[PDB]
Amino acid sequence: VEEKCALMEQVAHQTIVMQFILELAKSLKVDPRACFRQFFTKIKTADRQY
Amino acid sequence: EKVTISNRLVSSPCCIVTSTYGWTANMERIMKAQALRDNSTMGYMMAKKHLEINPDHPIVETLRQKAEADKNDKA
């Protein structure tokens, strides 16, 4: 309700990463808590297309 | 998964298509048919497929007019 734009963007970021991690782990049948490194290396070097 | 009709065929009863997010035929084949494949998880993830029919080859028309008669046939 408070319409916190930077907070809202970061909320979208955190929820999308957690949802993606959970679906990837479930289809992957691996514990999500041990599935962050490939995501970090993909998103840290996320270029203009990515 | 899905079956539809499109504009890609002139003389083939049916053809097959891949998803918008999915490796094509040759890509999937070459990827899986190479050593150190590591198929444990990545193998069981890709290659979604669909289907299409041309409504021009009379074989499909006779098939449809046969299927409209019997709904549980054998052949």
From Swiss-Prot, chain A:
Post-translational modification here is noted as: Constitutively sumoylated by UBE2I.
Superkingdom of the source species: Eukaryota
Q: Where in the cell is it found?
A: Cytoplasm
Family named by the database record: Belongs to the CDC37 family.
Quote the subunit structure annotation.
Probably forms a complex composed of chaperones HSP90 and HSP70, co-chaperones STIP1/HOP, CDC37, PPP5C, PTGES3/p23, TSC1 and client protein TSC2. Probably forms a complex composed of chaperones HSP90 and HSP70, co-chaperones CDC37, PPP5C, TSC1 and client protein TSC2, CDK4, AKT, RAF1 and NR3C1; this complex does not contain co-chaperones STIP1/HOP and PTGES3/p23. Forms a complex with Hsp90/HSP90AB1 and CDK6. Interacts with HSP90AA1. Interacts with AR, CDK4, CDK6 and EIF2AK1. Interacts with RB1. Interacts with KSR1. Interacts with FLCN, FNIP1 and FNIP2.
Function of the protein: Co-chaperone that binds to numerous kinases and promotes their interaction with the Hsp90 complex, resulting in stabilization and promotion of their activity. Inhibits HSP90AA1 ATPase activity.
**Name listed for the protein in its UniProt record:** Hsp90 co-chaperone Cdc37
Which source organism?
Answer: Homo sapiens
Q: What is the gene name?
A: CDC37
- Interval of the full protein contained in this chain: 199 to 248 of 378
UniProtKB/Swiss-Prot annotation, chain B:
Q: What induces it?
A: By heat shock.
> Which residue positions does S-nitrosocysteine occur at?
15
The cellular location(s) given in this protein's UniProt record come to: Cytoplasm; Melanosome; Nucleus; Secreted
| Post-translational note | Ubiquitinated in the presence of STUB1-UBE2D1 complex (in vitro). ISGylated.
Which residues does this entry mark as bearing N6-succinyllysine?
A: 2
N6-acetyllysine carried by residues: 49
Query: What protein family is recorded?
Result: Belongs to the heat shock protein 90 family.
Describe its assembly. Monomer. Homodimer. Forms a complex with CDK6 and CDC37. Interacts with UNC45A; binding to UNC45A involves 2 UNC45A monomers per HSP90AB1 dimer. Interacts with CHORDC1. Interacts with DNAJC7. Interacts with FKBP4. May interact with NWD1. Interacts with SGTA. Interacts with HSF1 in an ATP-dependent manner. Interacts with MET; the interaction suppresses MET kinase activity. Interacts with ERBB2 in an ATP-dependent manner; the interaction suppresses ERBB2 kinase activity. Interacts with HIF1A, KEAP1 and RHOBTB2. Interacts with STUB1 and SMAD3. Interacts with XPO1 and AHSA1. Interacts with BIRC2.
Per the entry, what this protein does is:
Molecular chaperone that promotes the maturation, structural maintenance and proper regulation of specific target proteins involved for instance in cell cycle control and signal transduction. Undergoes a functional cycle linked to its ATPase activity. This cycle probably induces conformational changes in the client proteins, thereby causing their activation. Interacts dynamically with various co-chaperones that modulate its substrate recognition, ATPase cycle and chaperone function. (Microbial infection) Binding to N.meningitidis NadA stimulates monocytes. Seems to interfere with N.meningitidis NadA-mediated invasion of human cells.
* Domain writeup: The TPR repeat-binding motif mediates interaction with TPR repeat-containing proteins.
Q: Per its record, how is this protein called by name?
A: Heat shock protein HSP 90-beta
Tell me which species this is from: Homo sapiens (Human)
Q: Which gene encodes it?
A: HSP90AB1
Q: State start and end of the fragment within the whole protein.
A: 576 to 650 of 724
